[PDB]
Every structure is written in C-alpha cells, then in structure tokens.
Write a protein that binds this DNA or RNA. Sequence first.
RNA 1: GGGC
RNA 2: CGCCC
Length: 198
Amino acid sequence: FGLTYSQLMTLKDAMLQLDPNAKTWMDIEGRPEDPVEIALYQPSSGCYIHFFREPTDLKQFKQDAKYSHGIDVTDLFATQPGLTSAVIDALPRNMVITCQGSDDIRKLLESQGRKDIKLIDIALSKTDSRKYENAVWDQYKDLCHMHTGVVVEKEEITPHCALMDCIMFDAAVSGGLNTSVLRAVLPRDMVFRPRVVL
RNA sequence: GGGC
RNA sequence: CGCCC
Ligand SMILES: [Mn+2]
Ligand SMILES: [Mn+2]
Ligand SMILES: [Mn+2]
Ligand SMILES: [Zn+2]
C-alpha cells in the first residue's frame, strides 16, 4: 500500500495529535478521484495535515491549474505515493469533518472506504467563504509555495490552496481570523522524498 | 450556482 | 462556461 511499518508507526503517532472530537476542516485541490493537494485543519489545537500527490490525468490537471489551484506539476515530483490512502485510513472512526462543498470530499472518503465519516457542509457562497482570503494569505503564506501558476476567473485571482481554504472557511464561519500558531502534523520527510551519479 |  | 455536481 506504499508505506513501510516504520513510516506507518510515525504516521499513526503523529495523527494522535488530532483531537477526535474537535472541529476538523478538510479541503482538496484536484478532482476527488485524482487529488493533488489534501489538507485537514483543527483550529482548536492549530494542528494541520498538509500533503501532495501526483496527478494521473495530466490533461485535466493543467486545465484545473488555470482555473483553480495553479500548481506547477514539476513541483509534485518528490511526493510520497500511497500517502492519501494511509492518512485517510488512519482518521478516527466516525469522525465529523466540516468543509465547503461536500460532494468532492465525500467521493474521496468513500473511494477510501470511509463511509463512517460524517460530513458537515457549510454551503456558503464563493464571496462569503472567501471574505478573509487576503488575511489568511497575509499570515500563512509561508506554509505553501506550490501555487505559482496564474489563475484566472477575465480576471486574475488568488490561487486555491487546500490549506488556506480550510483556514479561511473557518474564519468565515467564526466571523473573524485569530492570531494563532499553526503546527504541522506530518514530518516534512514523509511528505517529500535524490543522488548522485545517474 | 457550488467544486476543481 | 474550460471541466464537474
Ligand atoms: Mn473544496
Ligand atoms: Mn479548494
Ligand atoms: Mn460558478
Ligand atoms: Zn497549497
């Protein structure tokens, strides 16, 4: 399934930092059956899961990049295969996950056999959900560098990040953005994999 | 319209 | 309106 026992032990220990009962956001970039960026966020603790995956459909990816995420495909080369399945399978049983537009999130969780996970859809408008878009990027821009491509709507807009979306959707529901220290759940060497002769 |  | 619900 991708991961050695040593890595599985590290992952399951890291995911115990998630409070099984706390408010948990989840957003993805890319199609549900072919995701390229996955993020979970718990505002109560400041814990976040954030990782990437290589697209199977390159033609769909390049098209999605111009209208949504703006991820350069070259930057996804060092990603760990099987991370998506391993993280989702390690999520607490009957966990309650909140997000904007639950349809794609549901299809991804169901494709991983996690029908037990309950989903709350906030179902806000694009304007209401992204009221604190500027404020989130102003505070947390250093947490993701992957969105370098120009994203259009014809008007240039801020690229869609799975992690930034989780934070800004929370700020919209709470009616404000808190100054809080964020903590990465996954080790950096687990997200990304490189020598020397050939 | 919502998601990408 | 590129795709998708
Ligand atoms: Mn989404
Ligand atoms: Mn998004
Ligand atoms: Mn629309
Ligand atoms: Zn990102």
